[PDB]
Amino acid sequence: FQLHDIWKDLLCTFTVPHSAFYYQLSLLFDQEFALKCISKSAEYSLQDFKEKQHIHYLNLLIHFEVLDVLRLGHECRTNFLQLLLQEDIDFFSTLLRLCNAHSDKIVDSILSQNLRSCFKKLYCFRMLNAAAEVLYQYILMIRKRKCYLMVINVLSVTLTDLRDELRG
């Protein structure tokens, strides 16, 4: 097929005439062949088509990196991404951590909102790396000691207040 250039689908593909062919194959085998063809076509191509392809690729990869790639790609349909990240939410968190490590707007805001939607505070802090401090303070408004401590270390007025509170 590549070298060159169910019945209803075939007719539709003929009418369209690579992307269509791969999409059809993927749908028909929905598996290895399907996934491979879909990925290849998506790569060769790179609103509706784009979104669909992206979603498919991400799902296939999470079933078998991909997340960060797709994200940066689309950034360079916001609610769609909000839903995708909704599905993402441990593996997702690991990927995010990896992206942050690599780094060391819209994407950032969306992420912050999703995280705001122990575990929570931690994720929030990791991402923001002020937001961390605010979240911790709000949650605080053993646990107390740990929070005050984390706040003091991050800051290094606030410290004095925290110390006084811990001493009181």
């Binding site: 802090f125 984390m150 003091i152």
Partner: protein, 90 residues
């Protein structure tokens, strides 16, 4: 001595580090040596310990620091930040 033996011998290393932090809490030079050891090594309990150490935090100490390098407070803060980041990633 037990701590050094454990060091010579991951979980063991963590236990040794914890023992060291506990010793530091019980007790400046010692604290500096501990910080140096932590930097060389570079979860919740560990973070708590690091925090307590930061809360706790002269010429002889500076000399020891210089010998180790062969500013200190800043390096310590940096290490603490790194540890916090690691805990967040975990």
């Amino acid at each position: 001595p037990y701590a050094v033996l454990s060091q010579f011998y991951d979980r063991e290393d963590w236990g040794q580090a914890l023992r060291l932090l506990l010793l530091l809490i019980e007790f400046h030079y010692l604290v500096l040596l501990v910080a140096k050891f932590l930097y060389p090594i570079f979860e919740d309990s560990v973070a708590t310990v690091i925090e307590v150490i930061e809360t706790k935090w002269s010429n002889l100490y500076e000399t020891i620091i210089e010998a180790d390098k062969s500013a200190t407070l800043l390096k310590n803060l940096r290490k603490k930040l790194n540890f916090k980041l690691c805990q967040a990633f975990m």
